[PDB]
RNA sequence: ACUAUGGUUUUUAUU
RNA sequence: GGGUGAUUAGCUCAGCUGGGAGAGCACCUCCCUACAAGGAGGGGGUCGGCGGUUCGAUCCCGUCAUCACCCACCA
RNA sequence: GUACGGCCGCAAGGUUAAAACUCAAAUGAAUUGACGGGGGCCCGCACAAGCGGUGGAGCAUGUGGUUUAAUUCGAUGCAACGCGAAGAACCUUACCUGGUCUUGACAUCCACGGAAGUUUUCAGAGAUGAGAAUGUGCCUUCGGGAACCGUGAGACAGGUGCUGCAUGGCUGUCGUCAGCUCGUGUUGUGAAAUGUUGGGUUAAGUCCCGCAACGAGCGCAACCCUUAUCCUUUGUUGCCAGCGGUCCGGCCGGGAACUCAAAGGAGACUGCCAGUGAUAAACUGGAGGAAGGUGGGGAUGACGUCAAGUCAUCAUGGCCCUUACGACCAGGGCUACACACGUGCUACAAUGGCGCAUACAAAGAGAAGCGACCUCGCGAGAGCAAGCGGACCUCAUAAAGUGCGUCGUAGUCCGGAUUGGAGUCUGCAACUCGACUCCAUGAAGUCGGAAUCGCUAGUAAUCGUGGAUCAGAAUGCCACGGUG
């Protein structure tokens, strides 16, 4: 009923001491294998530098900021039938959701090479069209109607 | 109990050790030939393979204290139920139940 | 829950075994078959000798066999020749020479093995069941126990119904690892029912 | 959102 | 005076190959539970009777009885 | 408060007001349970946030019910259904059929003939039923026996048959939940209350405070076991920094530094300080250090448990059979599906597969055993044979991972089931229904539909290693490690 449990900082990256990259490999990890993420890491940014990649000071941290989650909800109750309410997420959650939104948008249809399917999504992460934006507005049209009686 | 299951054991595992725990050489002689496409043995195989009351097969050891076919432990001579019974009474050396 | 003896579940707590020896990996189970045979023989020959336990040590290429008895004078005879015929047979079923060590139990009414026999005595003549356990409690606390628990189950009355009775005095304490608790369960073999008897006794930590 | 009804019988108790 | 349907199990009734006795509720009894519901196996027949046909008639023809139903029965 | 008659009313009615018939309890009062679609309030991987799944496909695999000559017997409220009863040709077997003998497979006392045994032929599915040879041992108050193989008595023997509505024992589980007993006092007509209720606060009757309740027990907590860092003691079949020699091999001298294997000391007490708060107790935060805040974790199970399971782990009251609900054999059934429900594991891919090389163990097991080396061959297998009693050999080039070629969305020339051919072995013997190998063969299948799981850390997720059971064969049952 209070969770809130422990404290877990995790480790930074071994080559530049990055905190965001060492977390992003924990999103591309599947079957407990991090090697498959290290085939996609830096190669997506270097493949963006074959199409549109200008400046690399933040690598992909601003693509993860042009990607913008806003439509998260929770359920409120006093018994049986429940009432939906929207929530104002913390930057640590906003970032954790943006990291899934973009790699799930790059996985939407089957093609070759995830570094290249992600570079196509990062070249879109300056104007943000279709995937990771068109579902957001279709549920945001209730975002004040679900505040009315608190 | 069914004491007929021990009457099987007495003429199987308790009598096989001197006659059936090594016996496969006594049939392999019928595969000992001087040349291919040639016979010297014919149907004598059915006399070398004549025993039926004793076999290398059908041999169950059973628990030596309960006659039970499942849950025996060869290293103690006891079953799953008697390992606890001897251990709780302290009547078996080297074995303890907790606390590592 | 599961009951079990407080001895072997606490044997990791500086406690001794009832059989202590080391044997070859091709006959350890056959030496443990001998370890059962010597008890199943002696508990039929010494059946009136008030035996509380039989402990097995195997020194000097022999079997020691240590018998804790409240009636040693009918085990050793008059004197030391009646046991020479006994250890001849113990050595036969063991496959090794046999010593025999006879130890006198000072307080049999303090030991859960013989307190159950002292209760079984009064169930032969059917005294009031709720007195029979209180006498066993009184006699044990007067003998230097720091607590005792009893239980008697089935055909205690009076009528055809099956009931249980207990009473408890002093300390147990069953979760205390160092308590070295003395325990027994038995039957009174009555002419209707059987009457089951349980006893737990506490003396002090190790 | 709100959320119908439940067939027959059921301890010895001693001094 | 002429036509038409019925009479089969304690109670209500079905009726496809003519070698056929049956469904549910009642009667008996096992399973599940001690009952009951629910499952399953049994007991008990004037298939209204007689004659004819038929290898055999509840089962088709004919006809006697009793009950229902439309007609005729003084002018 | 219905009937009859009266009385009052325009009237519905109001008022007076029976008897027959009928049952073992109705009711007032205070008290304890238990429930609410009452109130407050504790806490939970019940919700919250994240991810991997189940519910399709193909095989494996568990259960019920009907069925059947067996489809053994049990466990259905939430405590049944990969489970008790570990590897179904015959076996093992409870179940079932056709044979056979009834003092009987199993146990003893007496009589009667035989040594125990060893060999060999016929009848028979075999159990066994008939012959033909062989051996005559032990004790010899010298009596004739013992013992052993059977047979015929009188007592008997047999039963995992049926009953936990007969039980002693065994046991599920609330639940690691914080609660429960034994006594004495007091209040109350007494049942009953108190304390065990309250105020902080914990995993906790915690650790203090306090009221008419105060002691002694069982729990909680502790005991015992295990670990992070320093110091010490000690070193082969373990270790190898320095140094001599070298099958150049920690290999041999040798060292004792360093892993490690291991006993012993130090370290951690909410103890220090701040913030809250009875200048309370207790938490939250800070400091130290390798690191706290039941240290992280084990063994953990107080009372009473459901009109609850187990007589198939063992005894045992009762019922019943023995021309058998035996036992000794040959075969069956346990691998019927007319219908009712689940758990796995593998592919559904590309961020992947396939083929061919390569790095790392951890923990067991191993003298009629683990089996090297080298082979014969397409290969299972078969052949020869060393080391090894296991810190000195063998099982055993761990697989994920690291890499190079290659394949590609075609619903997969992927997945390779499945149907054949050629075999190799195990056993009395592989029709159904046995393993393992080589060459053919060719299929469903884009993580899913109502709906719904487990974990806050070496956990969830994922890929390999070993052992017990052992004629030949586990997708069964338990440990060990990499990635995380």
mmCIF file of C-alpha atoms (C1' of nucleotides) in Angstrom, chain F residues 50-354:
data_model
loop_
_atom_site.group_PDB
_atom_site.id
_atom_site.type_symbol
_atom_site.label_atom_id
_atom_site.label_comp_id
_atom_site.label_asym_id
_atom_site.label_seq_id
_atom_site.Cartn_x
_atom_site.Cartn_y
_atom_site.Cartn_z
ATOM 1 C "C1'" G F 50 7.126 -1.890 -16.205
ATOM 2 C "C1'" C F 51 8.119 -6.208 -18.793
ATOM 3 C "C1'" G F 52 7.761 -11.497 -20.179
ATOM 4 C "C1'" G F 53 3.749 -14.600 -20.778
ATOM 5 C "C1'" U F 54 -1.310 -17.859 -21.253
ATOM 6 C "C1'" G F 55 -6.141 -17.990 -24.612
ATOM 7 C "C1'" G F 56 -4.147 -19.852 -32.297
ATOM 8 C "C1'" A F 57 -0.488 -23.884 -34.615
ATOM 9 C "C1'" G F 58 2.449 -28.972 -33.757
ATOM 10 C "C1'" C F 59 3.828 -32.537 -30.463
ATOM 11 C "C1'" A F 60 4.274 -33.992 -25.339
ATOM 12 C "C1'" U F 61 1.307 -34.291 -20.963
ATOM 13 C "C1'" G F 62 -2.400 -34.115 -16.228
ATOM 14 C "C1'" U F 63 -7.778 -34.783 -14.895
ATOM 15 C "C1'" G F 64 -13.244 -35.914 -14.917
ATOM 16 C "C1'" G F 65 -17.429 -38.523 -17.085
ATOM 17 C "C1'" U F 66 -19.638 -42.035 -19.991
ATOM 18 C "C1'" U F 67 -18.084 -46.503 -21.747
ATOM 19 C "C1'" U F 68 -15.589 -51.557 -20.965
ATOM 20 C "C1'" A F 69 -14.482 -58.318 -19.902
ATOM 21 C "C1'" A F 70 -10.076 -53.668 -16.578
ATOM 22 C "C1'" U F 71 -10.469 -48.938 -18.255
ATOM 23 C "C1'" U F 72 -6.978 -49.714 -10.539
ATOM 24 C "C1'" C F 73 -8.161 -46.207 -5.787
ATOM 25 C "C1'" G F 74 -8.238 -41.566 -3.913
ATOM 26 C "C1'" A F 75 -8.060 -35.873 -3.673
ATOM 27 C "C1'" U F 76 -14.419 -30.735 -6.532
ATOM 28 C "C1'" G F 77 -15.687 -24.921 -2.741
ATOM 29 C "C1'" C F 78 -11.645 -20.833 -3.092
ATOM 30 C "C1'" A F 79 -6.538 -26.404 0.430
ATOM 31 C "C1'" A F 80 -8.821 -31.756 -6.640
ATOM 32 C "C1'" C F 81 -6.766 -32.061 -12.449
ATOM 33 C "C1'" G F 82 2.997 -32.922 -13.903
ATOM 34 C "C1'" C F 83 -0.495 -35.434 -8.140
ATOM 35 C "C1'" G F 84 0.337 -39.685 -4.004
ATOM 36 C "C1'" A F 85 1.894 -44.624 -7.067
ATOM 37 C "C1'" A F 86 10.199 -42.137 -11.055
ATOM 38 C "C1'" G F 87 11.027 -44.204 -16.402
ATOM 39 C "C1'" A F 88 3.785 -49.644 -19.221
ATOM 40 C "C1'" A F 89 6.154 -55.481 -25.172
ATOM 41 C "C1'" C F 90 6.204 -59.739 -20.850
ATOM 42 C "C1'" C F 91 6.906 -57.398 -16.400
ATOM 43 C "C1'" U F 92 6.071 -54.393 -11.984
ATOM 44 C "C1'" U F 93 -0.552 -54.461 -11.085
ATOM 45 C "C1'" A F 94 -4.076 -52.730 -7.280
ATOM 46 C "C1'" C F 95 -7.857 -53.903 -12.052
ATOM 47 C "C1'" C F 96 -9.597 -58.199 -15.639
ATOM 48 C "C1'" U F 97 -10.090 -63.291 -18.230
ATOM 49 C "C1'" G F 98 -8.976 -68.619 -19.022
ATOM 50 C "C1'" G F 99 -6.034 -72.334 -16.515
ATOM 51 C "C1'" U F 100 -4.452 -74.850 -11.287
ATOM 52 C "C1'" C F 101 -4.246 -75.946 -6.093
ATOM 53 C "C1'" U F 102 -7.073 -75.191 -1.420
ATOM 54 C "C1'" U F 103 -3.281 -76.004 6.025
ATOM 55 C "C1'" G F 104 -2.414 -72.758 0.616
ATOM 56 C "C1'" A F 105 3.098 -67.957 -2.179
ATOM 57 C "C1'" C F 106 3.569 -66.567 3.556
ATOM 58 C "C1'" A F 107 4.155 -69.010 9.862
ATOM 59 C "C1'" U F 108 4.519 -72.989 13.838
ATOM 60 C "C1'" C F 109 3.584 -77.883 16.791
ATOM 61 C "C1'" C F 110 2.693 -83.791 14.990
ATOM 62 C "C1'" A F 111 2.737 -88.029 11.630
ATOM 63 C "C1'" C F 112 4.525 -90.168 6.778
ATOM 64 C "C1'" G F 113 8.108 -90.681 2.596
ATOM 65 C "C1'" G F 114 12.360 -88.450 1.062
ATOM 66 C "C1'" A F 115 19.108 -85.766 2.223
ATOM 67 C "C1'" A F 116 19.901 -80.521 0.472
ATOM 68 C "C1'" G F 117 20.894 -81.032 -4.261
ATOM 69 C "C1'" U F 118 23.000 -82.185 -9.469
ATOM 70 C "C1'" U F 119 21.583 -84.057 -14.786
ATOM 71 C "C1'" U F 120 18.195 -85.230 -18.842
ATOM 72 C "C1'" U F 121 13.570 -86.619 -21.974
ATOM 73 C "C1'" C F 122 8.271 -86.396 -22.917
ATOM 74 C "C1'" A F 123 2.918 -83.813 -22.084
ATOM 75 C "C1'" G F 124 1.274 -78.713 -21.495
ATOM 76 C "C1'" A F 125 0.470 -71.628 -23.189
ATOM 77 C "C1'" G F 126 2.820 -72.189 -18.780
ATOM 78 C "C1'" A F 127 1.739 -73.197 -13.900
ATOM 79 C "C1'" U F 128 3.043 -77.955 -13.570
ATOM 80 C "C1'" G F 129 2.245 -83.475 -14.704
ATOM 81 C "C1'" A F 130 4.823 -88.184 -16.006
ATOM 82 C "C1'" G F 131 9.725 -90.902 -16.748
ATOM 83 C "C1'" A F 132 15.311 -92.108 -16.825
ATOM 84 C "C1'" A F 133 20.235 -91.488 -14.432
ATOM 85 C "C1'" U F 134 23.107 -89.319 -10.235
ATOM 86 C "C1'" G F 135 24.272 -87.983 -4.621
ATOM 87 C "C1'" U F 136 22.994 -90.132 0.589
ATOM 88 C "C1'" G F 137 26.012 -85.278 3.816
ATOM 89 C "C1'" C F 138 25.178 -83.954 9.948
ATOM 90 C "C1'" C F 139 24.447 -86.028 15.169
ATOM 91 C "C1'" U F 140 25.191 -91.197 16.878
ATOM 92 C "C1'" U F 141 23.660 -91.911 26.463
ATOM 93 C "C1'" C F 142 24.393 -95.228 20.823
ATOM 94 C "C1'" G F 143 17.966 -94.619 21.452
ATOM 95 C "C1'" G F 144 17.289 -93.799 16.559
ATOM 96 C "C1'" G F 145 17.145 -88.710 15.616
ATOM 97 C "C1'" A F 146 18.231 -83.656 13.852
ATOM 98 C "C1'" A F 147 17.849 -80.601 9.952
ATOM 99 C "C1'" C F 148 16.006 -79.801 5.170
ATOM 100 C "C1'" C F 149 12.338 -80.875 0.784
ATOM 101 C "C1'" G F 150 7.278 -81.849 0.610
ATOM 102 C "C1'" U F 151 2.667 -84.029 1.948
ATOM 103 C "C1'" G F 152 -1.990 -85.320 5.345
ATOM 104 C "C1'" A F 153 -4.255 -83.670 10.057
ATOM 105 C "C1'" G F 154 -6.065 -80.183 14.421
ATOM 106 C "C1'" A F 155 -5.545 -75.139 15.736
ATOM 107 C "C1'" C F 156 -4.527 -71.653 11.508
ATOM 108 C "C1'" A F 157 -2.589 -68.719 7.293
ATOM 109 C "C1'" G F 158 -4.406 -64.809 3.208
ATOM 110 C "C1'" G F 159 -6.991 -59.634 1.957
ATOM 111 C "C1'" U F 160 -2.838 -52.031 -1.237
ATOM 112 C "C1'" G F 161 -11.016 -55.861 0.093
ATOM 113 C "C1'" C F 162 -15.089 -51.891 2.306
ATOM 114 C "C1'" U F 163 -15.446 -48.250 6.200
ATOM 115 C "C1'" G F 164 -11.086 -41.652 9.028
ATOM 116 C "C1'" C F 165 -19.831 -41.578 10.552
ATOM 117 C "C1'" A F 166 -15.048 -46.559 15.070
ATOM 118 C "C1'" U F 167 -9.873 -44.728 15.857
ATOM 119 C "C1'" G F 168 -4.255 -44.515 17.622
ATOM 120 C "C1'" G F 169 -1.025 -42.058 14.228
ATOM 121 C "C1'" C F 170 0.027 -39.134 9.621
ATOM 122 C "C1'" U F 171 -1.764 -34.430 7.402
ATOM 123 C "C1'" G F 172 -3.681 -29.952 4.440
ATOM 124 C "C1'" U F 173 -3.988 -24.727 6.046
ATOM 125 C "C1'" C F 174 -5.402 -19.359 8.260
ATOM 126 C "C1'" G F 175 0.361 -17.661 8.304
ATOM 127 C "C1'" U F 176 5.338 -15.238 9.797
ATOM 128 C "C1'" C F 177 -0.748 -13.744 10.852
ATOM 129 C "C1'" A F 178 0.718 -11.399 15.957
ATOM 130 C "C1'" G F 179 -1.791 -13.659 18.468
ATOM 131 C "C1'" C F 180 -2.916 -17.490 22.560
ATOM 132 C "C1'" U F 181 -2.892 -20.024 27.586
ATOM 133 C "C1'" C F 182 -2.391 -20.989 33.488
ATOM 134 C "C1'" G F 183 -3.581 -18.374 37.856
ATOM 135 C "C1'" U F 184 -5.044 -14.489 41.285
ATOM 136 C "C1'" G F 185 -7.863 -9.927 41.952
ATOM 137 C "C1'" U F 186 -12.021 -6.726 40.685
ATOM 138 C "C1'" U F 187 -16.663 -5.366 38.308
ATOM 139 C "C1'" G F 188 -21.543 -7.571 36.891
ATOM 140 C "C1'" U F 189 -27.659 -10.754 39.614
ATOM 141 C "C1'" G F 190 -25.022 -13.909 36.031
ATOM 142 C "C1'" A F 191 -23.454 -15.251 30.979
ATOM 143 C "C1'" A F 192 -19.764 -11.677 30.547
ATOM 144 C "C1'" A F 193 -16.186 -7.804 30.950
ATOM 145 C "C1'" U F 194 -11.123 -6.358 32.397
ATOM 146 C "C1'" G F 195 -6.009 -7.069 31.240
ATOM 147 C "C1'" U F 196 -5.356 -8.557 25.428
ATOM 148 C "C1'" U F 197 -9.024 -1.503 25.396
ATOM 149 C "C1'" G F 198 -6.224 3.521 24.542
ATOM 150 C "C1'" G F 199 -1.665 7.245 22.608
ATOM 151 C "C1'" G F 200 2.686 7.326 19.635
ATOM 152 C "C1'" U F 201 5.301 3.784 16.668
ATOM 153 C "C1'" U F 202 7.086 -1.661 14.332
ATOM 154 C "C1'" A F 203 7.780 -7.055 10.411
ATOM 155 C "C1'" A F 204 5.976 -7.775 15.609
ATOM 156 C "C1'" G F 205 1.459 -7.201 22.486
ATOM 157 C "C1'" U F 206 7.437 -4.081 18.602
ATOM 158 C "C1'" C F 207 9.823 0.034 22.234
ATOM 159 C "C1'" C F 208 8.037 3.549 25.881
ATOM 160 C "C1'" C F 209 3.574 6.094 28.036
ATOM 161 C "C1'" G F 210 -1.079 5.141 30.530
ATOM 162 C "C1'" C F 211 -6.572 2.923 33.013
ATOM 163 C "C1'" A F 212 -8.534 -1.860 37.762
ATOM 164 C "C1'" A F 213 -5.666 -5.242 36.549
ATOM 165 C "C1'" C F 214 -0.989 -7.741 38.082
ATOM 166 C "C1'" G F 215 2.424 -12.222 37.747
ATOM 167 C "C1'" A F 216 4.198 -17.102 35.196
ATOM 168 C "C1'" G F 217 4.222 -19.825 30.455
ATOM 169 C "C1'" C F 218 3.636 -20.563 24.485
ATOM 170 C "C1'" G F 219 4.537 -17.132 20.189
ATOM 171 C "C1'" C F 220 7.145 -12.443 18.271
ATOM 172 C "C1'" A F 221 12.609 -11.450 19.266
ATOM 173 C "C1'" A F 222 16.932 -14.766 20.579
ATOM 174 C "C1'" C F 223 19.937 -19.571 20.370
ATOM 175 C "C1'" C F 224 22.634 -22.320 15.792
ATOM 176 C "C1'" C F 225 24.342 -21.620 10.553
ATOM 177 C "C1'" U F 226 26.376 -18.082 6.362
ATOM 178 C "C1'" U F 227 28.911 -13.395 4.101
ATOM 179 C "C1'" A F 228 31.318 -8.120 2.551
ATOM 180 C "C1'" U F 229 37.161 -5.687 4.704
ATOM 181 C "C1'" C F 230 41.636 -5.878 7.955
ATOM 182 C "C1'" C F 231 44.855 -9.197 11.214
ATOM 183 C "C1'" U F 232 46.535 -14.114 12.639
ATOM 184 C "C1'" U F 233 47.368 -19.591 12.501
ATOM 185 C "C1'" U F 234 48.284 -23.561 8.612
ATOM 186 C "C1'" G F 235 49.293 -25.685 3.233
ATOM 187 C "C1'" U F 236 49.011 -31.049 -0.699
ATOM 188 C "C1'" U F 237 46.955 -34.353 -4.832
ATOM 189 C "C1'" G F 238 45.642 -26.586 -4.105
ATOM 190 C "C1'" C F 239 48.219 -21.697 -4.980
ATOM 191 C "C1'" C F 240 52.782 -19.227 -7.974
ATOM 192 C "C1'" A F 241 55.077 -13.086 -6.839
ATOM 193 C "C1'" G F 242 60.640 -13.645 -6.518
ATOM 194 C "C1'" C F 243 64.904 -17.387 -7.578
ATOM 195 C "C1'" G F 244 67.881 -22.269 -9.662
ATOM 196 C "C1'" G F 245 67.027 -26.277 -13.208
ATOM 197 C "C1'" U F 246 63.749 -27.369 -17.279
ATOM 198 C "C1'" C F 247 59.520 -33.576 -21.737
ATOM 199 C "C1'" C F 248 59.731 -25.696 -21.513
ATOM 200 C "C1'" G F 249 54.543 -28.312 -18.702
ATOM 201 C "C1'" G F 250 53.572 -24.720 -11.683
ATOM 202 C "C1'" C F 251 56.884 -29.429 -14.763
ATOM 203 C "C1'" C F 252 60.824 -30.349 -10.476
ATOM 204 C "C1'" G F 253 63.362 -27.916 -6.623
ATOM 205 C "C1'" G F 254 61.320 -24.449 -3.742
ATOM 206 C "C1'" G F 255 58.513 -19.930 -1.748
ATOM 207 C "C1'" A F 256 54.244 -18.590 1.831
ATOM 208 C "C1'" A F 257 53.766 -13.377 -1.266
ATOM 209 C "C1'" C F 258 48.525 -14.188 -3.993
ATOM 210 C "C1'" U F 259 43.666 -16.929 -5.206
ATOM 211 C "C1'" C F 260 41.515 -20.772 -2.436
ATOM 212 C "C1'" A F 261 40.277 -24.440 1.352
ATOM 213 C "C1'" A F 262 39.692 -23.390 6.474
ATOM 214 C "C1'" A F 263 39.553 -22.411 12.146
ATOM 215 C "C1'" G F 264 40.135 -17.890 15.128
ATOM 216 C "C1'" G F 265 39.919 -11.918 16.421
ATOM 217 C "C1'" A F 266 38.172 -6.955 14.823
ATOM 218 C "C1'" G F 267 33.288 -4.463 12.628
ATOM 219 C "C1'" A F 268 27.220 -2.257 13.694
ATOM 220 C "C1'" C F 269 24.989 -0.819 19.298
ATOM 221 C "C1'" U F 270 19.812 3.379 16.522
ATOM 222 C "C1'" G F 271 25.334 3.774 19.372
ATOM 223 C "C1'" C F 272 26.607 9.671 17.256
ATOM 224 C "C1'" C F 273 24.264 14.251 15.178
ATOM 225 C "C1'" A F 274 20.025 16.959 12.943
ATOM 226 C "C1'" G F 275 14.481 17.067 11.642
ATOM 227 C "C1'" U F 276 9.516 15.506 13.415
ATOM 228 C "C1'" G F 277 7.331 14.212 17.961
ATOM 229 C "C1'" A F 278 4.290 13.723 25.160
ATOM 230 C "C1'" U F 279 12.684 18.378 26.679
ATOM 231 C "C1'" A F 280 8.599 10.673 25.562
ATOM 232 C "C1'" A F 281 9.257 6.369 22.964
ATOM 233 C "C1'" A F 282 10.068 5.964 17.716
ATOM 234 C "C1'" C F 283 11.048 7.008 12.592
ATOM 235 C "C1'" U F 284 13.244 9.901 8.487
ATOM 236 C "C1'" G F 285 17.880 12.058 6.965
ATOM 237 C "C1'" G F 286 23.152 12.725 7.621
ATOM 238 C "C1'" A F 287 28.377 10.649 9.184
ATOM 239 C "C1'" G F 288 31.874 6.542 9.343
ATOM 240 C "C1'" G F 289 33.220 1.953 6.631
ATOM 241 C "C1'" A F 290 33.633 -3.105 2.517
ATOM 242 C "C1'" A F 291 28.673 -2.405 4.490
ATOM 243 C "C1'" G F 292 23.788 -1.381 8.671
ATOM 244 C "C1'" G F 293 18.887 -0.031 10.495
ATOM 245 C "C1'" U F 294 14.355 -7.953 11.731
ATOM 246 C "C1'" G F 295 22.203 -6.156 8.849
ATOM 247 C "C1'" G F 296 21.507 -8.837 3.634
ATOM 248 C "C1'" G F 297 19.575 -14.358 4.464
ATOM 249 C "C1'" G F 298 18.538 -19.585 6.459
ATOM 250 C "C1'" A F 299 15.991 -23.457 10.213
ATOM 251 C "C1'" U F 300 11.548 -20.396 10.466
ATOM 252 C "C1'" G F 301 5.444 -22.529 12.347
ATOM 253 C "C1'" A F 302 1.949 -20.223 19.765
ATOM 254 C "C1'" C F 303 -3.725 -21.652 20.359
ATOM 255 C "C1'" G F 304 -7.743 -23.273 17.927
ATOM 256 C "C1'" U F 305 -8.844 -24.882 12.614
ATOM 257 C "C1'" C F 306 -13.525 -27.538 7.628
ATOM 258 C "C1'" A F 307 -20.011 -31.221 10.470
ATOM 259 C "C1'" A F 308 -12.049 -31.262 5.998
ATOM 260 C "C1'" G F 309 -8.511 -35.366 3.948
ATOM 261 C "C1'" U F 310 -5.453 -40.434 4.769
ATOM 262 C "C1'" C F 311 -7.206 -47.704 7.016
ATOM 263 C "C1'" A F 312 -2.449 -47.533 -0.385
ATOM 264 C "C1'" U F 313 3.428 -45.789 4.958
ATOM 265 C "C1'" C F 314 1.958 -48.811 9.870
ATOM 266 C "C1'" A F 315 -1.388 -50.731 13.577
ATOM 267 C "C1'" U F 316 -6.542 -51.639 14.742
ATOM 268 C "C1'" G F 317 -12.886 -52.171 16.384
ATOM 269 C "C1'" G F 318 -16.505 -53.940 12.796
ATOM 270 C "C1'" C F 319 -18.543 -56.308 7.897
ATOM 271 C "C1'" C F 320 -17.456 -60.088 4.307
ATOM 272 C "C1'" C F 321 -14.929 -64.064 1.093
ATOM 273 C "C1'" U F 322 -11.833 -68.532 1.043
ATOM 274 C "C1'" U F 323 -15.197 -74.997 -4.454
ATOM 275 C "C1'" A F 324 -12.038 -67.252 -3.354
ATOM 276 C "C1'" C F 325 -12.644 -59.786 -3.600
ATOM 277 C "C1'" G F 326 -6.198 -65.964 -2.903
ATOM 278 C "C1'" A F 327 -1.583 -67.645 -5.286
ATOM 279 C "C1'" C F 328 1.447 -69.959 -9.481
ATOM 280 C "C1'" C F 329 1.303 -68.955 -15.163
ATOM 281 C "C1'" A F 330 -0.301 -67.365 -20.431
ATOM 282 C "C1'" G F 331 -2.583 -63.072 -22.204
ATOM 283 C "C1'" G F 332 -5.261 -58.481 -21.463
ATOM 284 C "C1'" G F 333 -6.469 -53.379 -19.185
ATOM 285 C "C1'" C F 334 -3.764 -49.092 -17.285
ATOM 286 C "C1'" U F 335 -1.960 -45.847 -25.000
ATOM 287 C "C1'" A F 336 -11.770 -47.039 -25.546
ATOM 288 C "C1'" C F 337 -13.421 -40.955 -26.893
ATOM 289 C "C1'" A F 338 -19.714 -41.024 -28.739
ATOM 290 C "C1'" C F 339 -17.973 -35.027 -24.568
ATOM 291 C "C1'" A F 340 -15.922 -31.829 -20.714
ATOM 292 C "C1'" C F 341 -11.466 -28.755 -18.940
ATOM 293 C "C1'" G F 342 -6.102 -27.376 -18.386
ATOM 294 C "C1'" U F 343 -0.396 -27.162 -17.924
ATOM 295 C "C1'" G F 344 4.077 -27.323 -20.869
ATOM 296 C "C1'" C F 345 7.553 -26.944 -24.931
ATOM 297 C "C1'" U F 346 9.062 -25.674 -30.010
ATOM 298 C "C1'" A F 347 8.432 -22.581 -34.638
ATOM 299 C "C1'" C F 348 5.404 -18.122 -35.723
ATOM 300 C "C1'" A F 349 11.804 -14.781 -36.814
ATOM 301 C "C1'" A F 350 14.971 -10.518 -39.222
ATOM 302 C "C1'" U F 351 17.035 -6.745 -33.419
ATOM 303 C "C1'" G F 352 16.515 -13.630 -36.858
ATOM 304 C "C1'" G F 353 17.912 -18.502 -38.596
ATOM 305 C "C1'" C F 354 21.304 -22.050 -41.076
#
